[PDB]
Design brief:
- The structure is a homopentamer.
- The first copy, chain A, is mostly beta strands and 197 residues long.
- Chain A has one domain: Neurotransmitter-gated ion-channel ligand-binding domain (Acetylcholine Binding Protein, Chain: A).
- Chain A contains one helix and twelve strands; from the N terminus they run H-E-E-E-E-E-E-E-E-E-E-E-E.
- In chain A, strands 1, 2, 3, 5, 6, 7, 8 and 10 form an eight-stranded mixed sheet that branches.
- Chains in contact: A-B, A-E, B-C, C-D, D-E.
- The interface between A and E is medium-sized, with 28 and 25 residues.
- Bound molecules: ligand 7JI (5 copies).
- One ligand 7JI sits at the interface of chains D and C.
- Chain A: Homopentamer.
- Chain A: To the extracellular portion of ligand-gated ionic channels family.
- Chain A: This is Acetylcholine-binding protein.
- Chain A: GO terms for molecular function: extracellular ligand-gated monoatomic ion channel activity; transmembrane signaling receptor activity.
Chain lengths: 197, 198, 199, 196, 200
């Protein structure tokens, strides 16, 4: 089997609209790497950031034997199921800056790392101090509760040319629940502690 | 039945372009806005930029399945379902949907759609910097379906603490509009956001 | 016949790319703007940003069905229908459609499309801050269909009370343009919005 | 044959991705508006009708007993890959993306375009005015595949612009690149304009 | 064989989603930027807006045809062929392609793609209003294909009407690797040394 055969197989087997549960939730790993802080407004409490959203999960149906073939291919995400992640305090659409390609590994692991520019409503107070501001970004599945999707977290790539610098990034698991229903929604709370240089 | 079987059944039965009227009764659409943010307010132009969750529910009993030994809910892309053609009458920008365009379908045939929307409105911003605050009225209804086809029924907890504004009161009242040409009435929800600068 | 049957039949007979000329008659397109808002006015650059409902009606008799014992109207996405290729000649932005892109089809074959449009125009903004106000003229017609293929016919109630501007008068007059090349005439409606800044 | 039959036939015969061979493409700009001029950055924002004609004989039909012209979406036709070499924004097509096809196989496409250009704005606030040169040609087809031929410059120009047109000149030209022997044909449109 | 036949054959054999690796060799992608214009420079935010031609070439031997008695080159929409998934690592906007999205395919299987791109970068703008000027570094490589799948090789048209002038452009090969994995990603580092015209 050559690359074309693996890709043909993935396209004919992929169910983009069907969460690939093995009765277990799909374990989605999410890690933000901050690349840039572009605009900060201490009056409106708004930030414009660029981050790589490292996103991994498993779809065992996509797996193939790679003893005598490539163990990884690039696949357009429009061909694959993708977690329906959203940032709860986003105030703009995520602008994906990068090619919308995922990597599929022969064991069925899927890796997606879009570079995203997005605006958030978060605490910008203290940005011009030594201690800096702490902007909290909550990312979770919009429509899949904890029995369907679990979200697990895990300044190296931050631009030296930003007016801001990063003091600390903290990535903590959290859970939200609504008055209506017993369903809990898992999220990652990403705490970006940063300040003006 | 697994998730794929429920979704294939929904795909084969759902007619995205056909309102699911039972007999000649209207489809009862529930609409509830939850305000998340007030981003830009202009007291001179009377324009406000808001973020809200538009909780939208209705019934398509043709989609129903037995969930005794199966999942009782799935996520479905809205392009596979009929969705109410709701619009805000006093919007001055396109709705920016911030969230994945998936609905939930429940085994009893309930459909639930909760987009997070950023949109700009023309409304009364006068008094925003006072104690009594401003009252901004948002009218949401079906653009093309009169009251015999769609009825719209209404029903601070999630408001960002980091907004420059705070919410005093949200009221959701049912209302109805009619045009000189025709006897048809269009139902809407009038959402009254009473808010002020902190 | 139920709504699904009417919609199936419309999709089978509708030719979105084919003007529905009955005999070899022009398709009579009715156009009526209802101004909802005036957002930005620049008296120096002579530019206005407006919101209007473009009430647009025409006949496609091939879509007709018997509506004794069926619904006499349905909502249909405009991507399933032929739609007039109307353009504003002094527009300087693309029309931003604010509303769902659904038309109403009546069982006699009448089609009604009422998009809410935000668009920017180049027009006369002089006098906006006076009592007599400015008169901004918007020219709307078919871009590619001359008068033997499309005729365009015209016909403050919904204006936002919260605008900084107020409407004194709207006039809708039929007009016709012809180009040096060809004998073909293009019909338009000239919509004259007389408005001013409030006291 | 009725309109539906002409359009059905165009869908069966048209190859949007195949140049209908050089194809002689006629290009003529009519300036409608000058919106923004910046003397410091040498940038202009203009609105123009790009009158574009060519022949695709494969589209032809007998019109003795049918319409001799139809409107066709450009996504159904081959269209010249014309670009402005000194554009600094994407062309914003303001108008419905329909061409006219004549029964002899002539195609006419007249988009109204808003676009920003890098060009000489020096003298704009003088009596002699500025001369802004806009170079339009095929991006990927050299002169053996596409030839570009030009055709009252102020007849359609908005009276409400802060600017006025003194002269529009449309001259044939050619570009060639260090790599290759191929020549690319262009029209150089010289817009002589000034502040009122 | 006429143009229609060549294009039909390209559509029948081209796999837009499949990198055309020959044996187990990487696809050699040649990338060369020609700067056309510098539009907006912000010395406070360290942001530039530039227009450049991204000359992109590679080989897809599956596309090849006999051109002894037919055209040796055609224009093909990029949606009909595989295209390298190049991205600028310090881009802060989507690339805005200003030009028709057509590649040239040569009968030997050579593919040439030259989009005119407007894009905003985060890079060092300090010194732009000095004699030595600013050096803005743009890193371009494959987003998803490591060095065993794609290799990136580097290899006059600047508007005379820009308020900036170009002192030097240097194009150097480089390689990145991530803590997770052994895979290396090739890039080109393009160094644009430029400054404001007309300083005293
Ligand atoms: C090539 C590249 C440029 C920038 C960021 N990348 C990354 O961050 C990672 C990465 C991912 C994880 Cl889960 C952990 C770590 Cl430590 C690194 C990575 O593999 N790649 C290549 C890829 C691009 N798209 C996909 Cl899918 S994989 C890059
Ligand atoms: C996960 C999440 C984030 C934000 C808002 N949501 C909500 O408001 C509700 C919700 C809906 C109703 Cl009708 C009543 C109540 Cl009390 C709550 C909800 O279920 N969910 C998940 C969903 C997202 N899209 C669909 Cl469809 S369901 C969330
Ligand atoms: C519900 C609604 C909100 C706003 C404007 N509308 C209108 O102006 C008219 C209308 C149309 C005409 Cl031809 C004459 C008159 Cl007097 C009124 C109308 O019927 N509707 C509903 C519709 C929306 N889209 C279509 Cl198609 S019909 C509304
Ligand atoms: C109706 C209209 C509004 C604006 C500009 N138009 C034009 O300039 C010309 C035109 C074209 C040429 Cl080649 C020479 C001359 Cl002298 C005039 C024209 O025929 N039309 C209609 C058309 C629009 N799109 C197509 Cl295709 S044909 C108009
Ligand atoms: C016509 C044109 C306008 C602008 C730029 N172009 C170029 O830069 C080059 C070019 C390419 C290389 Cl690899 C080296 C050199 Cl030295 C020049 C070129 O051939 N062409 C035509 C083409 C445009 N798109 C394709 Cl595909 S071929 C132009």
């Amino acid at each position: 089997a050559d690359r074309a055969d693996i890709l043909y197989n993935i396209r004919q087997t992929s169910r983009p609209d069907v969460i690939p549960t093995q009765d277990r939730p799909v374990a989605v790993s999410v890690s933000l790497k901050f690349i840039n802080i572009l605009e900060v407004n201490e009056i409106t409490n708004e930030v414009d950031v660029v981050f790589w959203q490292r996103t991994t999960w498993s779809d065992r149906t996509l797996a193939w034997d790679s003893s005598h073939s490539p163990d990884q291919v690039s696949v357009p995400i429009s061909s694959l199921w993708v977690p329906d992640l959203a940032a709860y305090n986003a105030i703009s659409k995520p602008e994906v800056l990068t090619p919308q390609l995922a990597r599929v590994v022969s064991d069925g692991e899927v890796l997606y790392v879009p570079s995203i520019r997005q605006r958030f409503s978060c605490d910008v107070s203290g940005v011009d101090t030594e201690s800096g501001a702490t902007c909290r970004i909550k990312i979770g599945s919009w429509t899949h509760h904890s029995r369907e999707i679990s979200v697990d977290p895990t300044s190296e790539y931050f631009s030296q040319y930003s007016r801001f610098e990063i003091l600390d990034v903290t990535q903590k698991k959290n859970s939200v629940t609504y008055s209506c229903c017993p369903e809990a929604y898992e999220d990652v709370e990403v705490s970006l502690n940063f300040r003006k240089k």
